[PDB]
Design a protein around this ligand. Structure first.
Ligand SMILES: [Zn+2]
Lengths: 222, 105, 111, 14, 1113
DNA sequence: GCATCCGTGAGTCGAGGAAGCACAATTTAACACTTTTGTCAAG
DNA sequence: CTTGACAAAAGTGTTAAATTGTGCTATACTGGGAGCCGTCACGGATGC
């Protein structure tokens, strides 16, 4: 079983676990030798360990069996046709309930992750990680434009009244919290929901008027 | 200054029925000498319409008033049988050497 | 304050457990289909923090209002995602294992 | 000693 | 432009096919043309006959024959669809049940074997690739002197690489011979007893020597039975394993007697027979027959070692670096080795499969798993060091690349493990390996080029041709001989004068065992075919090679490869005669197969009517993008109705003029300093070159995008990109791709793609902005393809491949792929690198107008100005002679062919210059013009300098100056003459692939790395410049503490620091004080992961948290 | 004092990206129903 | 500033379908396979 994603000693130890299970379940009344019954459990344990531990991204045993069956069918069709089969033939040969899309998705799932330290070039001075940009942390441009947008919005809200600006900040999450509903803001200010909605709409209209007369905030919309 | 060949999009293409590609046609046109008989004229357009099999030269341009071709024997292209060459060449007047990337006419 | 000296010293098992935010009990890295990290795995959000800023795994807290809070449904602390670069784990070995740097580095310090 | 498989085989051969 | 040829050496044989090293070897390996019954046991057929039959031990899987089918797709289709040009390989196998006595035969499909194109290169995954031949130590028996102890020698038995362990035999101080295998040393007496040798036999054979034979006699081992001796040998080799006779004999047989595991090789066996004077039955150290071991090579090796130690006259040590002891593995041998590895893996899989599961009902198709073989083959053809990405900038580039020999690669030397011994030019490199041509730098001497006349033999030893000389007369008989055979004869030189066929010179310069000697014509045994056989293809293209220093001729030959094709490329004025041969053998041009008449001529195809009447249509490769980005196009050179003879030219290939290799332009070059613009190899060009489109090339760039399937939704390639104006989408058609022929600039969109945005709430400021503007956020975002900065051009091709297309095997999860080929016409500009065949290279530093360049008295301005100071230091005098000959040709209207080391000499160039001056000044006399006053002043200054004879008329002084190659050159600015005559001529200058347009790069902010958060590297990835250790040391030396701190923190990895600095700069403020870098945080975290407590302290030794409490529980 | 195994090091940029089968335990898409608003009329 | 009617947006509670994980195969099998190789110099222990 060597060369299937697990080292030799790992396979030996998993087979030892299977052997212990076989000893637990072995019955000598049937007059069969221990090797015959123990082989089943040893190979079962080895195969289960290969299915559960030979991939960096774990795949369930049923999906591993599906991938193995798909690979066997693809290999058989490839040797029969003398060429690489298309997804249609593989799906047809697999059986009912299989189409080209499902075969493509299964093949996509069966893609092992690629190492980040694989050298490229004659010299051992390059790696994959040197060509993969980091797209999680904001770029300096993104942080700068976010700060500019915050400053411009704060300056624009100064034109609004004291209550209207606070209502808009509460309703849009400018207080770092989740956008408070109309009833929450109304209870905070002791006002009914309809009046809160009306004052928010009036303040939004006033901000629209100011933006139309100034056009100092449109570029940040993108 | 400018050239437009019918059914040709860019200068990196080959015209069917023509031995020379568009690059070679442009190179041949760059050697064309045009004399304006009218000083006030600044830009002219010469129309060439030829059908193979022939050797289309600079003399095959349609005559234009107050315009003369000083080298009618200049070789422009070789049209194979079944090939056609319809083109318009815009010639302007200027000074110095103006690269095509600058004027972009 | 300003950093003036740097000290390096052996890390006791108690100190190592103090550093860790949780024991990594499974080798699973991520799910193959949902692409979310598996619980108690090498990439668990419950140990090393959320993938994105201010968002729990269960998707109940999604704002800075609950800053410094640990969700009861999922256990993922609601904080900046950058803590994922700074939060470590620990594996509790069944039996002790010697550090190779103190064994094969001649002269062997343990020896 | 250097090969773990060799040591394991020697152990199981006893 | 008539061609005048110089030289007196008459070559008896033409140049061999320059690509035969790659083509013939692969033809031998495949054997796809010879019928299966006539196939010999070489190549993959030998691999089949070696691994097969497979025995379970009563099931036998035997191999009968193999065949190769037609390739599924042509070369053009494979290139367009990014496929691999390969042919299906099927094997015919039979399954025999020994007990039952039944045979089951069927043809199994082993897979695909990549095919070689006619030019000698493969097409792997749609990319042209070349397999580089590997030079290594030939297998066999060598006897090297022990450096540690003088007077002693050690025998080395070397099998094929990865085909057995190297065996060492040494004479220990005690007198007992020691055999070393796999770093384990043991007494050779034991293994020699295993081979069934008695004391009497050794005493009678090796006893006629010193005390070595007496030391070889140990009664402890001799009294031991061969079986017990074998068990003891197995115990010594492998300790711990239980002593079992079957396992021990199996291990010994697999170590020194198994042909499947040990393979001395055909070359190894031949070398062993040649050296030890024995006849090996096979290619193994020992033969296992009749249940016993029989000696093959150990006894002769020991006898030779003992005789060498004693000092017999007939035995000598072996030179490890001798080129007769070093062999070449071509594409055929490497492919055969990899096929053998894959077939061994397949046989192992069959064996482990044929012993389990329905043994009675078995077929060869079920047992055979062809996946390991295909995996090994694709690994060899893709991820191997010797399988290099083809360099096809010009036909000469590919031609050299196919003829390269590399000492590196799998199983060979290494760049930093190689000493001076392998990098030096051995005496046997004469006529087999080019001495001058090699990549300078860390790979000097490790990569070389095969000589022009050299050819690799069947066994892999490079041979060179020599003319047989008998009785003092040189015959036309040519013998191709190797170095070891070459060392046994006195070989004359090709430049020896001949009175017809008889040698005229009484004293002949010859070579004896690689050393120069002076001999008589009677003692001459062989002669050189020609001076060209010593140098490779590139060096044979350098005129006046004898006047160039080797270090600079190396650079010239290397840079001849990097010359890009030009739309107005013209052949050099001074040639060597190999241009036509290079063009013909590079398969870049188009030639008529036989006599015929051209019926149709077109820019796309040529239709020819041959004599037999058949219509043959040759398509013309037009504006095809090469591997290096250059445009490879074929231009027809015939007309309709023109009759062509067999072998005549039909269409010029890339970088060719009428079948002659044209890598550059013949320009008027004046050798003089010019206002400091020539400083330090810089080159000054005239604007006249740009006016008439010289050094103007076409470069095609390929931009690839892929629309895939995503969990958020499938990416769609469409023209409707959100939040984009109509101006940006002007060039995009209805399908979202840029229209063919549209001009694109940096920042313009080539193909429009929209990707579904990740489900995530927006920031509160963005939500407030959207509410203010009343614009609902769309579900897709712009992820289209845009032209990177510094690129652009004219879009000439668009290729759209979709899933389900015939033969398009897209990667899983990818809906479609769009490739855009954009062609730009690059002209010469400041910063572009020019060079010449003599190694004089430099970047264009100034483009002067026509009226500023120095001009001849007849009004002809020079085109290029060169700094003379590059001549004396570099000692490349060949460029001066080429300049003189080019001046003569320019004023005579003719070209010259001067072969290297036998061609134009000084008197011939002087008489040509005399004729050129005669016509040049007779024209002026006929026009009615005398001698310029400025010319008179220059002549006076020259005669003050001793350049001309005083007292002569101005015409005679001008003629003398012209004979010296110098002319009176005026200044284009002042109008006054240059105070001294200036060497003005016509020189062939190439435009190299290194251009400032592709090398200029700049970056303010861009992508950052994953772990360290530092900026990426490379122009393609838009990365920053590496500020390594040495720059930091320079900054420390200057004491620029703040600049260094900024470059370490603010500009590199201080995330908060860099964000704040950018925000401050865009706000007009000063950048803030930097903070701790992220790299130090990564350092601390990794050290903690190594169970080391790294703590940062303050003045009072209190811990300081650099993580701002984010890592504190 | 000396032969010998082991470990570490050997320039800088750039341009190179091989079982299935049954069965039980866990998750979740699909609905059905209250709950909670967001907004609209009425001044 | 309020007081009622509507119309979705989100959450709660089943429902089985899909997915996932563990148990089981009873002639007899009883110690591995790949290496394998062209470098020199300098600590520095490891013994004789
Ligand atoms: Zn949560």
């Amino acid at each position: 079983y060597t060369g299937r994603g697990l080292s030799f000693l790992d396979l030996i130890q998993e087979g030892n676990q299977g052997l212990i299970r076989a000893v637990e379940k072995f019955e000598y009344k049937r007059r069969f030798k221990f090797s015959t019954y123990a082989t089943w459990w040893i190979r079962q344990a080895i195969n289960r360990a290969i299915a559960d531990q030979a991939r960096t991204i774990r795949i369930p045993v049923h999906m591993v069996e599906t991938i193995n069956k798909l690979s066997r069918t693809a290999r058989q069709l490839q040797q029969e046709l003398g060429r690489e089969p298309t997804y249609e033939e593989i799906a047809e040969a697999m059986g009912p309930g299989w189409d080209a899309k499902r075969v493509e998705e299964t093949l996509k799932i069966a893609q092992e992750p690629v190492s980040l330290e694989t050298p490229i070039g004659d010299e051992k001075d390059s790696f994959y990680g040197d060509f993969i940009p980091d797209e999680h942390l904001p770029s300096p441009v993104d942080a700068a434009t976010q700060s500019l947008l915050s400053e411009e919005l704060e300056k624009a809200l100064s034109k609004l009244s004291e209550r209207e600006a606070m209502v808009l900040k509460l309703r849009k999450g400018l207080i770092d919290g989740r956008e408070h509903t109309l009833e929450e803001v109304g209870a905070f200010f002791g006002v009914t929901r309809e009046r809160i909605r009306q004052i928010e709409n009036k303040a939004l209209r006033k901000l629209k008027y100011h933006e139309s007369r100034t056009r100092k905030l449109r570029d940040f919309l993108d | 200054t400018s050239v437009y060949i019918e059914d040709v999009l860019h200068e990196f293409s080959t015209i069917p029925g023509v031995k020379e590609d568009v690059v070679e046609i442009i190179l041949n046109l760059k050697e064309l000498v045009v004399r304006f008989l009218n000083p006030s004229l600044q830009t002219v357009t010469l129309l060439l319409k030829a059908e193979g099999p022939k050797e289309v030269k600079a003399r095959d341009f349609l005559p234009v008033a107050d315009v003369e071709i000083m080298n009618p024997d200049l070789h422009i292209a070789t049209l194979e049988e079944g090939g056609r060459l319809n083109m318009e060449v815009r010639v302007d007047r200027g000074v110095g050497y103006v690269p095509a990337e600058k004027h972009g006419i | 304050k300003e950093v003036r000296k740097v000290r390096i010293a052996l890390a006791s098992p108690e100190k190592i457990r103090s550093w860790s935010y949780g024991e990594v009990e499974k080798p699973e890295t991520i799910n193959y289909r949902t692409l979310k990290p598996e619980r108690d795995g090498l990439f668990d959000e419950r140990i090393f923090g959320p993938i994105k800023d201010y968002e729990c795994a269960c998707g109940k807290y999604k704002r800075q209002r609950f800053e410094g809070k640990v969700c009861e449904r999922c256990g993922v602390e609601v904080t900046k995602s950058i803590v994922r670069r700074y939060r470590m784990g620990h594996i509790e070995l069944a039996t002790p294992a010697a550090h190779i740097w103190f064994v094969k580095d001649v002269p062997s310090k343990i020896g | 000693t250097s090969d773990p498989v060799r040591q394991y085989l020697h152990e199981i051969g006893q | 432009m008539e061609i005048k040829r110089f030289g007196r050496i008459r070559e008896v044989i033409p140049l061999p096919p320059l690509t035969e090293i790659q083509v013939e070897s692969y033809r031998r390996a495949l054997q796809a043309d010879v019928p299966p019954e006539k196939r010999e046991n070489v190549g993959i057929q030998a691999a089949f006959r070696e691994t097969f039959p497979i025995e379970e031990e009563g099931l036998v899987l035997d191999f009968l024959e193999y065949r190769l089918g037609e390739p599924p797709f042509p070369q053009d289709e494979c290139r367009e669809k990014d496929l691999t040009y390969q042919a299906p390989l099927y094997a015919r196998l039979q399954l025999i049940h020994k007990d039952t006595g039944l045979i089951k035969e069927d043809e199994v499909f082993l897979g695909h074997i990549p095919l070689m194109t006619e030019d000698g290169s493969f097409i792997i995954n749609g990319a042209d690739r070349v397999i580089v031949s590997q030079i290594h130590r030939s297998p066999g028996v060598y006897f090297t002197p022990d450096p540690a102890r003088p007077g002693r020698y050690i025998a080395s038995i070397i099998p094929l690489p990865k085909r057995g362990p190297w065996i060492d035999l040494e004479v220990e101080p005690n007198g007992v011979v020691s055999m070393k295998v796999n770093k384990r040393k043991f007494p050779l007496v034991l293994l020699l007893r295993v081979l069934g040798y008695d004391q009497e036999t050794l005493a009678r054979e090796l006893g006629a020597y010193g005390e070595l034979v007496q030391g070889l006699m140990d009664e402890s081992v001799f009294a031991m039975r061969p079986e017990e001796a074998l068990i003891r040998l197995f115990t010594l080799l492998r300790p711990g394993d239980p002593p079992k006779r079957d396992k021990a004999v199996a291990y010994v047989y697999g170590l020194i007697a198994d042909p499947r595991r040990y393979d001395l090789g055909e070359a190894g066996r031949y070398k062993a027979e040649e050296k030890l004077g024995i006849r090996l039955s096979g290619r193994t150290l020992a033969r296992f027959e009749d249940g016993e071991f029989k000696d093959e090579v150990f006894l002769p090796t020991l006898r030779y070692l003992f005789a060498l130690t004693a000092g017999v006259p007939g035995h000598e040590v072996d030179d490890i670096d001798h080129l007769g002891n070093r062999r070449i593995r071509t594409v055929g041998e490497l492919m055969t080795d990899q096929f053998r590895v894959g077939l061994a893996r397949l046989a192992r899989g069959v064996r482990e499969r044929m012993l389990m599961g329905s043994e009675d009902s078995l077929t060869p198709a079920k047992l055979v798993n062809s996946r390991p073989l295909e995996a090994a083959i694709r690994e060899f053809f893709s991820r191997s060091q010797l399988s290099q990405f083809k360099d096809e900038t010009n036909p000469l580039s590919s031609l050299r690349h196919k003829r390269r020999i590399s000492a590196l690669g799998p199983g060979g030397l290494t760049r930093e493990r190689a000493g001076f011994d392998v990098r030096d030019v051995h005496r046997t490199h004469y006529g087999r390996i080019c001495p001058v041509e090699t990549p300078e730098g860390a790979n000097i001497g490790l990569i070389t080029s095969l000589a022009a006349y050299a050819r690799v033999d069947e066994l892999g030893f490079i041979r060179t041709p020599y003319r047989r000389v008998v009785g003092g007369v040189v015959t036309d008989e040519v013998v191709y001989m190797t170095a070891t055979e070459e060392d046994r004869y006195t070989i004359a030189q090709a430049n020896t004068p001949l009175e017809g066929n008889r040698i005229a010179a009484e004293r002949v310069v010859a070579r004896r065992k690689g050393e120069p000697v002076i001999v008589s014509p009677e003692e001459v045994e062989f002669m050189d075919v020609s001076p060209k056989q010593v140098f490779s293809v590139n060096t044979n293209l350098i005129p006046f090679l004898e006047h160039d220093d080797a270090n600079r001729a190396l650079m010239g030959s290397n840079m001849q490869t990097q010359a890009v094709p030009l739309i107005r490329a013209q052949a050099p004025v001074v040639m060597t005669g190999l241009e036509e041969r290079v063009v013909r053998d590079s398969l870049a041009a188009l030639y008529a197969e036989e006599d015929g008449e051209v019926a149709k001529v077109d820019g796309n195809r040529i239709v020819v009517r041959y004599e037999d009447g058949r219509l043959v249509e040759y398509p013309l490769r037009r504006f095809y993008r090469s591997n290096q980005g250059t445009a490879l196009d074929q231009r027809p050179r015939v007309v309709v109705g023109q009759r062509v003879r067999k072998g005549d030219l039909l269409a010029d290939g890339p970088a060719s003029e009428n079948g002659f290799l044209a890598l550059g332009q013949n320009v008027l070059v004046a050798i003089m300093p010019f206002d400091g613009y020539n400083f330090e190899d810089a080159i000054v060009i005239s604007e006249e070159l740009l006016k008439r489109d010289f050094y103007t090339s076409i470069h095609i760039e390929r931009y690839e995008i892929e629309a895939r399937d995503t969990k958020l939704g499938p990416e769609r390639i469409t023209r409707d990109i959100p939040h984009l104006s109509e101006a940006a989408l002007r060039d995009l058609d209805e399908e979202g791709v840029v229209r063919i022929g549209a001009e694109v600039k940096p920042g313009d969109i080539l193909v429009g793609r929209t990707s579904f945005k990740g489900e995530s709430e927006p920031t509160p400021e963005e939500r407030l902005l959207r509410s203010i503007f009343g614009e609902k956020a769309r579900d897709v975002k712009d992820t289209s393809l845009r032209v990177p900065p510094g690129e652009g051009g004219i879009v000439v091709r668009t290729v759209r491949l979709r899933r389900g297309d015939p033969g398009v095997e897209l990667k899983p999860g990818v809906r479609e792929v769009v490739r855009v080929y954009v062609a730009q016409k690059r002209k010469l500009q400041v910063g572009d690198k020019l060079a010449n065949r003599h190694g004089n290279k430099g970047v264009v530093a100034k483009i002067l107008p026509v009226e500023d360049m120095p001009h001849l008295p007849d009004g002809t301005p020079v085109d290029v100005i060169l700094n003379p100071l590059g001549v004396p230091s570099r000692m490349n005098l060949g460029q001066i002679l080429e300049t003189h000959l080019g001046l003569a040709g320019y004023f005579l209207g003719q070209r010259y062919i001067s072969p290297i080391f036998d061609g134009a000499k000084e008197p011939e160039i002087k008489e040509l210059l005399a004729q050129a001056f005669e016509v040049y000044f007779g024209k002026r006399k006929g026009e009615g013009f005398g001698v310029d006053k400025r010319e008179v002043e220059v002549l006076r200054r020259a005669e003050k300098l001793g350049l001309v004879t005083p007292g002569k008329t101005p015409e005679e002084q001008l003629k003398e100056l012209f004979l010296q190659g110098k002319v009176v050159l005026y200044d284009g600015r002042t109008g006054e003459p240059i105070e001294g005559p200036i060497v003005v001529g016509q020189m062939f200058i190439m435009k190299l692939y290194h251009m400032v347009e592709d090398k200029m790069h700049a970056r303010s902010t861009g992508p950052y790395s994953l772990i360290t958060q530092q900026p990426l590297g490379g122009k393609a990835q838009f990365g920053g410049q590496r500020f390594g250790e040495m720059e930091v040391w320079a900054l420390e030396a200057y004491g620029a503490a703040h600049t260094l701190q900024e470059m370490l923190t603010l500009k590199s990895d201080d995330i908060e620091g860099r964000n704040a600095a950018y925000e401050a700069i865009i706000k007009g403020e000063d950048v803030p004080e930097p903070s701790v870098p992220e790299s130090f945080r990564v350092l601390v975290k990794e050290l903690q992961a190594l169970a080391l407590d790294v703590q940062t302290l303050d003045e009072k030794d209190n811990p300081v948290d650099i993580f701002e409490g984010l890592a504190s529980k």
